[PDB]
Design a protein around this ligand. Structure first.
Ligand SMILES: *[C@@H]1O[C@H](CO)[C@@H](O[C@@H]2O[C@H](CO)[C@@H](O)[C@H](O)[C@H]2NC(C)=O)[C@H](O)[C@H]1NC(C)=O
Ligand SMILES: CCCCC/C=C\C/C=C\CCCCCCCC(=O)O
Lengths: 49, 48
């Protein structure tokens, strides 16, 4: 959220291991237009290992 | 039917994602949580 936005041709990817997140902080920085989710929900993204 | 319950309020059309099922936002969490245990239909409309 604080760098130059990558293009779709060369998009960025980050893999997170051995860390604790806080989804309530990330949802305040954005306004969500649409979420399309398979086998999971954002409320399930909020809690789980 | 045996009953017909209607819940209505004013809400911007740009925020459909905040009322979709599975949302984790503050609007579902603190303001309006839909029942989803009876046949229900939520409609978004513009009233003149
Ligand atoms: C996860 O992020 C949220 C969002 O910043 C944190 O909530 C904040 O908590 C501080 C400390 O009490 C308050 O001063 C802010 O006003 C809160 N912001 C919001 C938007 O509620 C929350 O504390 C974080 N979770 C953890 C475990 O630290
Ligand atoms: C899961 C936290 C770790 C990943 C963070 C990376 C990007 C997060 C950016 C936005 C998070 C939104 C997740 C759910 C989207 C729909 C929110 C809702 O309307 O219900």
């Amino acid at each position: 959220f604080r760098e130059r936005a990558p293009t779709i041709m060369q998009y960025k990817r980050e893999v997170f291991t051995r860390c604790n997140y806080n989804l309530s902080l990330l949802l305040s920085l954005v306004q969500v237009d649409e979420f399309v989710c398979d086998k999971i929900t954002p409320e399930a993204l909020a809690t789980g290992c | 039917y045996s009953s017909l319950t209607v819940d209505w309020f004013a809400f911007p059309y740009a925020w459909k994602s905040y009322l979709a099922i599975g949302s984790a936002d503050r609007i579902v969490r603190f303001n309006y949580n839909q029942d989803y245990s009876n046949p229900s239909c939520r409609i978004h409309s513009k009233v003149n």
